[PDB]
Amino acid sequence: MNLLQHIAQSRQQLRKSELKVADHVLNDPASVMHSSMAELAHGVGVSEPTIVRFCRAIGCSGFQDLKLKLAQSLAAGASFGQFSIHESDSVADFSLKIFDTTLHSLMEVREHLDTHALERAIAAIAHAQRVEFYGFGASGAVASDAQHKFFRLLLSAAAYSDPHMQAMSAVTLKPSDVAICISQSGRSKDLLITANLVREAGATLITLCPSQTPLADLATVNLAIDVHEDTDIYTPLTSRIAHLVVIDVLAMGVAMARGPDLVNHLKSVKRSLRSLRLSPK
Template identity: 55%
Template structure:
């Protein structure tokens, strides 16, 4: 028996109530589920041979507020979900069971994040970062660990950069930022009050604020360059797991994008950085 997909079933059931042009969109989506996840609204309109407003009406016919929300539902419904929050640990689970559940859930959630990630959002963030002289990373808890990792990556890229997970330090630092500087605000929930306060101060300074957070949350709405990362986790039982990994991967995308913009001449600088820390590593030959 084939695996049932509730969202695909919802689209099929909604077709009788749709306009003729919206039905064309529905039929294209049903026949091209994998491809649609990676499309922009202009691409889907062209392939389904309808207008972009028709795509928006199609989304609203499914009780969604727009094309981005539709893509999220498509990506989520196309992934085999487990539970910890997404997967459940039983008392008699072996270490092998726990390993499989955690890895399988993380892999599936990361694929969902990749499919949902808006390349235009990432490109806009890379543009802002590439022009910045100073880049600051703000986050609390597990997001603070992501901020620290991001600081290390961007320090290697010759940025004046720092990571703060203390609200007072965030505020004091944000007020000293200048135009074209960048703040990257990282939040698994998108609703952290102290982070929002720091972002407000940064915005008042006229700097770009990039967010890594779920869509339609206060953090995402406040940022002028939001990057949507939406992973549901049971943080009442466990600290954020997969969302932390997903945020790290998005930071990697931003760092690689910036390094690419710096051109091939920048490779010499990275080689010098690598050489500078090579003496800190144990040499296997010296142990023989």
């Protein structure tokens, strides 16, 4: 377990004095490592006992343990991704950690699914003429990925990561239609504007985001996907995998809702690639 991630996760447990230590530590770990307890206490503006209580609340044995573990937690890639990367990891180590973390997160998401929320989303999309996917950064990529899966299911599918296009498109939706807003944070300002416009048009807003976020509150159907990845700190990685697997379940659901006609539709779609891909052998 990477001590900096642990400290970041732990902040809502600390007392105010200890929190001040936590934030000083997160802001500059490498100074702390060459710091006496007195210097650090001076730095943060707290007593030496506060330092030690912080260390113990973090699960270290005391100040020397803090520094030791800090020294093991400063890999550059530990900041890149929420994986327990250690200063000296090899492809051997980080490859398996990344896959294992992904497996563990998807299992957790699978376990926590709101099956009913899924059923309502699938039935909304299945009755829609248009489905749109809205998001930014990582969630924009998910949006366009989802458009590529959904365009073949006998409706109009579109994805936008330009908020001006989202707004203008949204307000043209019939109440009969669906928009999915995708957000690991649930806190993207433009996306809440867009979500409000969807609502105002009377269309179904599906939120693919954690529960009890600003965006979740606006939703018609809150999918409640609670991957624990702190994207104020880490690159979004695990969160978008979970989002895409959820997208795939909605798509499957919509396919389910179509007739035996779909089979031949999908066969035409695949046939159209014949001249663009070499034959197998």
